[PDB]
Amino acid sequence: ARVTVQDAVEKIGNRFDLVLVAARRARQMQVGGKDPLVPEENDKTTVIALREIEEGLINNQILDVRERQEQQEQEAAELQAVTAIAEGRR
């Protein structure tokens, strides 16, 4: 579905970073599978990762706040579930 990354490299003006961002976002859709933001058309996970980068909804900045927001909301799932040992012991 993707023959060239000439357009998905203008959001990131560097080839050696496009192969790092999309190499990491293209793992979340394979292990610990999150959801591809774009509607897939029977493609792999790689080319789906290179199709978000062109439309700005992924980059090296969004790809952390999208997650570190989750890394602590699971710690919001830590304390709020920590009440489960708070009310289970008394």
Binding site: E78, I85, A86, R89, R90
Partner: protein
């Protein structure tokens, strides 16, 4: 009498960690044992007559009582095999008998000294204790336990002495507690621990 059955006889202690260290391995093998939370001033009768050394705990199985924190939790790991608790290679086995000796002689005195020590030692010990337990931080990243995949006895020497963390006035401080504090989420709520914990020792969890 006491050993008249094929059953055990454990004159355990309700607060003394020797009981709570033993009962973990004691119940982690799925064996029908008898709990008797008893005191030093007044334990049960059998705990003083057949126990010519009078320690806590004390396990008795059809031949004689076995009194120690080590001789007991060793006698069970060598007689009730499955699941296993100690490795096979004698190289990495006796070293697993070394951390247990570098804890009963290293982090035990920091508990008794905080039980009978002066006002500064209680934090001085808490000084040498709290930071030192942070000096062992990066260990847990590599291995899911104390340098061993399987749940082994060297871990059981920690958690009963990690369950009395704030009960004697301790709380963590510094960068990297998420590696050890998150680790406590992996050990403090196991069947070997959950069903084994004494409710008396629980109320200092809130």
């Amino acid at each position: 009498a006491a050993n008249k059955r094929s059953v055990m006889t454990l004159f355990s202690g309700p607060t003394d960690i020797y009981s709570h260290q033993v009962r973990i391995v004691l119940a982690e093998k799925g064996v029908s044992f008898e709990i008797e939370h008893v005191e030093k001033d007044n334990p049960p009768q059998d705990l003083i007559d057949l126990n010519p050394n009078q320690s806590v705990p004390t396990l008795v199985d059809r031949e004689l009582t076995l009194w120690e924190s080590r001789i007991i939790m060793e006698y069970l790991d060598e007689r009730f095999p499955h699941p296993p608790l100690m490795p096979v290679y004698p190289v990495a086995r006796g070293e697993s008998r070394l951390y247990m000796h570098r804890i009963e002689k290293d982090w035990y005195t920091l508990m008794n000294t905080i039980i009978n020590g002066s006002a500064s030692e209680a934090d001085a010990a808490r000084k040498q204790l709290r930071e030192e337990l942070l000096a062992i931080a990066p260990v847990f990243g590599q291995k899911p336990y104390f340098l061993s995949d399987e749940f082994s006895l060297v871990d059981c020497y920690l958690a009963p002495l990690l369950w009395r963390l704030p009960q004697l006035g301790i709380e963590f401080s510094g960068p990297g507690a998420k590696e050890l504090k998150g680790y406590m989420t992996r050990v403090f709520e196991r069947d070997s621990f959950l069903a084994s914990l004494t409710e008396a020792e629980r109320e200092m969890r809130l």
